[PDB]
Amino acid sequence: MLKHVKKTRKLRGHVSHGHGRVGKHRKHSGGRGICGGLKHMKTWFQKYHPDYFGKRGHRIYHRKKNDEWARWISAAKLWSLIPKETRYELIDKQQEGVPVINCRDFGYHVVVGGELSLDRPVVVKARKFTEDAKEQIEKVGGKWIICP
Amino acid sequence: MQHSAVSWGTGRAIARCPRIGGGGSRRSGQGAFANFCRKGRMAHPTTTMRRWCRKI
Amino acid sequence: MRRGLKKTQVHHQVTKIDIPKIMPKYKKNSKRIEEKKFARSLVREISGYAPYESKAISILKLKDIARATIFLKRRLGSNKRTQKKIKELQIAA
């Protein structure tokens, strides 16, 4: 298999390793951890990490992750949610039947905007359609129902 | 690392490395606690923390 | 983010039922209660009152109800236990 030689094997024979002669390699020049953010490491915090110091916002004890669950898919991928067998049957032969999609049965809750694939009417059930998703579903001739 | 050695310090025309204290035998006065000392532990001792298996 | 989603909420409909338990952990016994309520009215006659309950009666003889309420609030903890005790002492005075 493919391999690479370490850098220590090329460094035997030289009086130091790659650490110079004037500025030697000592233990902990400059402090341990992230110390000194206000005095001498000020220029490193300014270039790479603003907003490290200070408070902001309102503090909420014990956020419940399960109560605030929300998953979103675009409006475009609703024809992809139909399983592979019956998705074919709507195309070639049953061209007049209207499919009914339950987004909670697949694990999605919110529907963000997008453009539908084909020009046939559909029936979609979810929670909290966005304002663009209400518009481009009804443009084809569909209907949206808020579902428990 | 079984013994209880300590360095003697400077001012004796002798090295700085830790010497076995005590007296009464040939052992007392010899070096200890270093990788370059005889009957001393090695630097970077091996351990069972090392990864033994890979994932394919 | 939970505020706007809570304004529109629909509950899934299920038919309810109410069935009492076969073996409860607590069976209310009517005979066992009435002996406790009858025995307490007998013991309070032979024995007397507490030394803080005797001072609360003589204050209520002077109709200092607003003074007697702060006297029992310092002794017992809750405000509910004060108003349950004043009804026991206003009968006996």
Place this chain on the structure above:
Amino acid sequence: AAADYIREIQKAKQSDIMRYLLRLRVCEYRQRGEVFRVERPTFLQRARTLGYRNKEGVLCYIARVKKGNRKREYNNGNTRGKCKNARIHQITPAVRHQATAEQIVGKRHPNLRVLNSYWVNQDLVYKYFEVIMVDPFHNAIRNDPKLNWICKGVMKHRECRGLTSASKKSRGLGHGIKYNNTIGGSVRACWKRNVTTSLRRFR
């Protein structure tokens, strides 16, 4: 019935009857030592619910505690350290005074085992408690199924390990999110399993 007339009498400890009777027994206790032996318990209906049975091999004793904090003992107030921890006076003990009453009577009698204890009466200087102790090696208690559990091996000296109901409360056990500490066994068992990182095989 007669279990209820007694329990209501011995409940009100500020009445005219109980203030009369408690004054006489305190003057009887000062002539005695630290631990002495009584025959029948003073509070009958209270002691019966804690498991007491009028059988041979069940014995009752009474001890005393001095009712105050205990002072730390250094030479001149020198703890030889930082100033974060140099307080001496205001330090409260770990267990209740019911628990320290059991360790005194349990140490003096290595013959017996302990069950329970309760409060009797107070003074200016002391607090009085009554302890109930039972012989394991009597043949009358080795035979009945009702107290056959106390003759096991693991029931020796339940006071020194904190298993009696008097000193069990100070460890803080229960259900729910309020007892998030001691989530397994004891306090120290919960700490050890939380700090140690797990190194699995494949990672």
Place this chain on the structure above:
Amino acid sequence: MKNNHILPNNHRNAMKRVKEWHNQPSRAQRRAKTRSSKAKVLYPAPLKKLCPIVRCPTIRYNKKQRLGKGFTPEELKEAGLEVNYARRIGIRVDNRRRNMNKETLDLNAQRLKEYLSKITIFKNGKEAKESGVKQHLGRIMPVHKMTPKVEIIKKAEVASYE
């Protein structure tokens, strides 16, 4: 720290208290060994017991069904068993649970009839050891994962659908 990195957060006692998993393949051999040795002690009886079907609490897992702990005695009253008799057969009983609906009660009541129609009962253990009947080893009548189904509807009813 002399380049563009994230702020590192590594605790000081991370590598000082370590538990190592060296005994992982040796542990799994032992657990299958005592499981197989327990099977010969009760030969005609199955290895596991019966469990009910419940729903999961929160809204993230609201559409999932799961094997619960035990049966309430009111569902046994519909099937006709008594709780001192049903414990001797492989049935689990829970007493802390409370009844809520009719749909969750008619489901568990139908499930108890299917278990009763399969078990037999012999006289004594000498009779039972002599008969050679295949002994089940897995879970007893588990749930199975659902497959979603899309219904096709006509064009007229979409103006009046619910």
Place this chain on the structure above:
RNA sequence: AAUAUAUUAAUGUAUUGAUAACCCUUUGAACUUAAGCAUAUCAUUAAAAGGAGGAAAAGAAACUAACUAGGAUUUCUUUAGUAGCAGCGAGUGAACAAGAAAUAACCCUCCAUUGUAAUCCUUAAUUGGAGUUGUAAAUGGUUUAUUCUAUUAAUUAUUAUAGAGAAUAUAUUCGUUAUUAAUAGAAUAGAAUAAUGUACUUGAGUAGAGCUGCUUGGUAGUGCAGUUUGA
């Protein structure tokens, strides 16, 4: 001998010492990091003391949640280096839900049929006691069969259910492999012998307040304790 209990100064019964790993309580630091240092961190650590078992501790909701609702304890994965705590600096730090291993529930405290203490220890002996200020405790180990563990003793080709390995010299043995016996222990099943009445109990100087100190991620108790007061 000492500290205690029982019978009548004597006799019987129980405890005392060893540990250097895991377990339950008590007491309890500093070096170090913050590029100084005094709150903080190292640390609910090291040293020290007390107490038991082959495991110990815990354990049958005065719970979690806001759903179409779950269900005693323990351990693993994950939530998560997250919510939060802190000279808001350095740094420290949980739980529900979800997937699994393993599953088991019960007993005292009243007025237990008062047409009768029906109980309990001890003695060869209703012999001597205890007990109404309340004691209540059903009993047989004989025999047969099967399975598992530990220790001893015996037989093994020169073709091979034996090419694992040792020893001698430059074709032989011990064994391996595969079988039995003896002793001890454990579990399951059958047959036979013994044995079956009446039982409406729910936990006080506790829970909680005022002042005071420690602990926790718990923020104005998350938990504990002293003093005063106390349903």
